[PDB]
Structure formats: C-alpha cells, structure tokens
Amino acid sequence: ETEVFYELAHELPLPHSVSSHLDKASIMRLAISFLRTHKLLSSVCSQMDNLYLKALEGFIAVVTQDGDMIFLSENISKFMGLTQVELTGHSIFDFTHPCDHEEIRENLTLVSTERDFFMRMKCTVTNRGRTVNLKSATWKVLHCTGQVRVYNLSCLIIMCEPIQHPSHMDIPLDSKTFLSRHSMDMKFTYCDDRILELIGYHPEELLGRSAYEFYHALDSENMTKSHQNLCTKGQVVSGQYRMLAKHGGYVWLETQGTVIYNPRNLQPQCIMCVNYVLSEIEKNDVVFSMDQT
Amino acid sequence: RRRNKMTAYITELSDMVPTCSALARKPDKLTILRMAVSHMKSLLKHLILEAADGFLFIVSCETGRVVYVSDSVTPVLNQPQSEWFGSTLYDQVHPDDVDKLREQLSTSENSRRSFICRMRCGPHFVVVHCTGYIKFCLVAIGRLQPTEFISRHNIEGIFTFVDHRCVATVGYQPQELLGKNIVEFCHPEDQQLLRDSFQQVVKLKGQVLSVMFRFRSKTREWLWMRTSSFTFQNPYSDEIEYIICTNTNV
Numbered sequence: 298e299t300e301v302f303y304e305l306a307h308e309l310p311l312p313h314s315v316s317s318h319l320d321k322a323s324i325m326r327l328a329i330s331f332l333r334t335h336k337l338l339s340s341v342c343s344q345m346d347n348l349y350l351k352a353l354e355g356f357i358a359v360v361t362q363d364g365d366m367i368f369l370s371e372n373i374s375k376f377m378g379l380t381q382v383e384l385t386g387h388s389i390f391d392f393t394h395p396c397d398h399e400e401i402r403e404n405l406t407l408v409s410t411e412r413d414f415f416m417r418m419k420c421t422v423t424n425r426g427r428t429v430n431l432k433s434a435t436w437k438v439l440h441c442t443g444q445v446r447v448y449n450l451s452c453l454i455i456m457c458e459p460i461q462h463p464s465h466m467d468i469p470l471d472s473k474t475f476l477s478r479h480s481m482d483m484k485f486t487y488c489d490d491r492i493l494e495l496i497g498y499h500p501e502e503l504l505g506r507s508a509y510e511f512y513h514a515l516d517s518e519n520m521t522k523s524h525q526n527l528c529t530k531g532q533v534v535s536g537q538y539r540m541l542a543k544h545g546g547y548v549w550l551e552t553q554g555t556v557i558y559n560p561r562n563l564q565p566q567c568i569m570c571v572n573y574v575l576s577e578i579e580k581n582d583v584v585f586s587m588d589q590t
Numbered sequence: 591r592r593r594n595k596m597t598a599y600i601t602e603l604s605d606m607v608p609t610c611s612a613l614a615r616k617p618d619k620l621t622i623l624r625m626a627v628s629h630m631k632s633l634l635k636h637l638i639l640e641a642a643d644g645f646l647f648i649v650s651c652e653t654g655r656v657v658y659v660s661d662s663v664t665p666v667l668n669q670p671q672s673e674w675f676g677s678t679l680y681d682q683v684h685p686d687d688v689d690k691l692r693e694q695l696s697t698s699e700n701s702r703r704s705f706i707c708r709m710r711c712g713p714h715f716v717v718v719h720c721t722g723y724i725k726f727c728l729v730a731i732g733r734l735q736p737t738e739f740i741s742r743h744n745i746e747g748i749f750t751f752v753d754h755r756c757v758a759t760v761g762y763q764p765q766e767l768l769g770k771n772i773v774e775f776c777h778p779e780d781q782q783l784l785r786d787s788f789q790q791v792v793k794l795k796g797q798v799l800s801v802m803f804r805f806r807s808k809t810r811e812w813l814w815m816r817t818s819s820f821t822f823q824n825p826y827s828d829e830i831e832y833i834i835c836t837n838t839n840v
C-alpha cells in the first residue's frame with residue numbers, strides 16, 4: 298500500500314526531498330512520463346548533468362502530439378517557478394495562454410521538422426527569486442526552438458528560452474550591444490550612444506524615424522512577424538537582420554524586443570530593445586538608402 | 591473521476607513494463623507496483639543536440655584554450671574534437687569577434703554569460719548562440735539556428751532604397767537612382783501609366799499591382815521593365831511605410 302507507493306518515489310529520477318512528498322496519482326503520472334521519455338530516448342539515441350543543465354538559459358520540453366509534457370527539464374523551476382513534479386505529465390494547454398493554443402497545436406503536428414515559435418506559459422516566480430502561488434501567475438514569453446520526431450507517435454522536443462526583461466537583466470552586456478527605445482509602431486524615441494561607435498548614427502538623428510527605413514529590404518517580411526509577435530505576446534527575439542549603416546553598407550543585428558508597460562496605469566508605454574551587433578559594417582562602399590548620402 | 595484516472599494510470603504502467611505486459615493475467619495493484627519498482631531499479635546530451643543543435647565546451651578564461659569539448663561539436667560544426675582540443679576559442683572564431691570574446695571571457699568584473707559569435711566550420715562561419723557560466727573557466731553550450739532588383743519608394747515615387755542588383759539590371763549606381771523619382775527614368779509615353787500604377791498601389795493598400803514600362807538605362811536605351819509593387823503597412827499603426835517594387839527586365 299503506502300510502503301510500495303513510497304518505493305516508486307525513491308526510484309524516480311528525482312531527489313528524495315521532493316519525491317517522497319507527492320500523492321499516489323502524481324507518482325503514477327511521473328513514472329509513466331519517465332517511461333515514455335525513456336522509450337523516446339531509445340529512438341533518438343540510435344555526472345555532467347550539472348554542466349549541461351546549469352549552462353542553459355532555458356529548459357528542455359518533450360511534449361507528445363496530444364499536448365502531454367512527458368518531459369520537462371529541472372531548471373524549468375529556475376525560469377518558471379512551476380517545478381518539474383508539478384507539471385510533468387500534464388497538458389501544455391493547461392499551462393499556456395489560450396490565444397497561443399492554435400499555434401502550439403500547429404507546431405506539434407508533422408516535411409520540415411524544425412520548429413521555432415514564441416509561446417506564453419504560466420510563470421509563478423518574481424524577479425526577486427521568490428516563488429508565488431499559482432493563482433498569481435503571470436504570462437512569460439518563451440522562445441521555443443526544437444524538432445518534431447516520429448517514434449514508437451510523434452513528439453515535439455524543444456528548448457524554451459525566456460526573453461530577459463531589459464530592466465531586470467543580469468548578464469555582462471557586450472560593448473557590441475546597444476539599447477534602444479521605440480513607440481508601438483517601432484519608431485525611435487530613444488537610442489544609446491554606442492550606436493555612433495557601432496553603426497555610425499548619432500542618437501539624435503534617429504529619433505522620430507521609423508525603424509522600417511533603416512534595415513535592408515530583404516529582411517522586411519522577417520521583421521513584420523517579429524513586430525506582430527512583439528505586439529501580440531509582449532516579447533520577441535528577431536533573427537539576423539541587416540541594419541543600413543550611416544555612411545554606406547549594413548551591420549548584422551539580432552534584437553530582443555520587450556513591450557514595457559507603465560507601472561501606474563498598466564498601459565503599454567514603449568518597447569525596449571537590446572540589439573546585438575553581430576558584425577562590422579559590410580559592403581560599406583555600397584549605399585542603399587537615401588540617409589546614406 | 592479518481593478511480594477512473596488511477597485505473598488508467600495503472601493499466602498504462604502495465605503497458606509500459608515489458609515483463610508485466612507480457613503477462614496474461616493483469617496482476618493486482620500491489621504486484622504491478624512492485625514489478626515497476628523492480629523495472630526501474632534494474633535500469634540529456636542528445637536532448638540538447640536534438641532541440642537546438644548545441645554542444646558543450648569548457649574554455650579557460652585567461653589563455654582561452656578549451657579544457658573540454660563534447661563530441662557534439664562534430665554534428666554542429668563538422669569539426670573533430672582534435673581540432674578543438676589543444677586550441678583556443680580565439681582560433682575557432684571569426685577574426686572580428688575576438689574583442690567581443692574577451693569582454694565575455696574577462697573575469698575582472700564577473701556569473702552568467704550569453705553572447706553570439708561566428709565560429710568556423712567545415713572559410714565559412716556560422717552564427718552560434720553561446721550561453722554559459724563561470725566556474726577560472728567558462729562552462730557554456732553553443733547552439734546553432736540578376737534579372738531583377740528590389741527598390742523602395744515613398745508615396746510620390748522617390749527612390750528611398752535601392753539594392754545593388756540595380757547596377758546590373760539598369761547600369762545605374764544606387765546613388766544615381768536614390769533621391770530621384772521613378773517617373774524621371776520612365777519613357778514619356780509610359781509615364782502616365784507609371785503614375786496610374788502608383789495611384790492604385792496606394793488605393794489598393796496591401797494588394798499587388800503590376801505595371802510594364804520603358805526604363806531609361808545609363809546607356810540611354812529604353813529597357814522594357816515589369817515593376818510589381820505593393821504598399822507596406824506598419825503591423826501596429828497600419829501606416830504606409832513605403833512602396834516596395836521589384837523591377838524585372840523584359
């Protein structure tokens with residue numbers, strides 16, 4: 298009875314502090330999820346766990362075709378407040394924003410197997426490192442990049458990385474990165490000084506300008522989606538895009554955009570963007586826009 | 591229901607344990623649980639590689655030499671472990687990324703690390719997202735991820751953007767087209783047709799129109815050109831940002 302149910306908890310890949318404390322149904326759920334994850338690992342594969350799990354800025358999620366999160370990495374707690382035992386075996390739709398359930402579904406199916414999306418998940422931890430009850434759960438945006446794999450069913454194996462809020466940030470900021478503030482139409486309202494030392498624009502001559510005029514046309518589609526995502530979920534990470542340099546040429550960039558809300562009236566105030574300069578000025582002899590003259 | 595979900599959990603545990611599923615009579619709850627304890631007491635590097643094509647590596651903070659590199663560096667970069675072992679990160683990275691590398695490998699001020707750099711694979715470089723911490727050493731995982739020319743115009747028709755392929759399609763430098771209106775390079779007969787197309791693309795916001803006119807080249811010959819254009823709208827304010835044209839010869 299209790300003693301044999303207490304035995305499976307010890308034998309689950311969990312510490313004895315958190316395993317010896319769950320109910321019988323949770324033990325069954327975790328055991329079944331672990332066995333399904335092992336059955337899939339036997340398919341994908343034909344100590345150092347601390348290094349791999351600690352050096353990750355996200356968590357690994359193996360979700361079945363029906364939405365069952367049969368595997369969730371431990372560090373998920375560090376990023377979500379909701380820990381491994383409370384979420385493993387449950388449906389992804391029961392802990393994700395309903396306005397993203399259709400996209401989550403159309404990413405769970407199926408012949409390209411690579412998947413890259415943004416999804417909003419329940420988060421019950423604050424920036425002070427203190428975990429909060431599920432009733433006070435915010436929506437945290439997660440960039441999920443992974444693959445769909447058929448085995449014996451289909452599974453989505455993704456890495457979900459949170460997008461760091463520019464205010465509460467704790468990562469050496471490369472000198473090859475600069476900050477910028479925008480309105481909701483992505484027009485410059487503020488820029489950092491380093492843009493002069495990286496791209497060549499003075500922060501004054503960019504204010505009031507539409508950022509849609511300062512990047513290469515070949516990226517135009519790939520930016521709109523970002524904006525839309527940044528406007529639909531409040532956070533996005535763009536792809537590699539070419540921003541037209543000041544005196545000719547362009548510079549490669551990757552930008553993490555975050556919608557900032559006014560703390561007193563809870564209205565969207567502006568959009569803060571951390572831009573990572575990925576190269577020096579390429580094709581500096583070639584001019585593209587009218588501002589390069 | 592509690593009994594229905596618990597029974598479904600038990601029968602699913604029956605189906606997963608092989609030595610239990612091979613049985614004819616489904617054993618009682620006490621037996622299957624003991625048979626499951628015995629199955630588990632008898633018995634994620636690839637999960638990271640499957641998810642984001644990442645590989646782990648430990649580099650020294652002072653010299654930059656690697657003190658460990660996982661075998662996953664071969665699937666992600668087509669490079670042997672012998673190519674990475676005994677070498678520094680500064681050799682496996684684009685020359686224009688060493689300054690950025692130092693500012694991430696410097697333990698003077700710091701701890702977490704996150705940066706992007708181009709690593710050599712196979713003179714081809716691929717973009718790698720490196721996330722890790724300090725332990726000095728850096729424990730981090732690096733993961734992976736001319737018949738026409740495109741121009742952009744204001745509503746009036748002023749070149750505000752021109753790609754380099756124009757120098758082959760019409761023979762003009764990008765600076766020659768920029769600042770001037772597209773109808774200035776149009777044959778006077780077809781000029782009214784070009785303004786009519788620009789009148790519709792704005793009126794048919796989002797829709798794609800197509801006009802075919804004679805474009806004056808730098809050699810001063812009238813090259814017949816189909817310009818398919820459409821208005822670009824801001825995803826938030828729906829403001830017309832510009833008019834994107836793809837001017838194709840003949």
Ligand SMILES: O=S1(=O)N=C(Nc2ccccc2N2CCCC2)c2c(Cl)cccc21
Pocket residue numbers: 477483507508509510511512520521523524527533534535539540541552553554570572
């Ligand atoms: O002029 S830009 O090259 N275009 C930018 N971004 C941009 C433009 C249009 C649509 C969406 C975006 N983004 C929102 C978040 C991801 C990128 C940009 C930025 Cl955000 C900062 C500096 C310079 C430039």
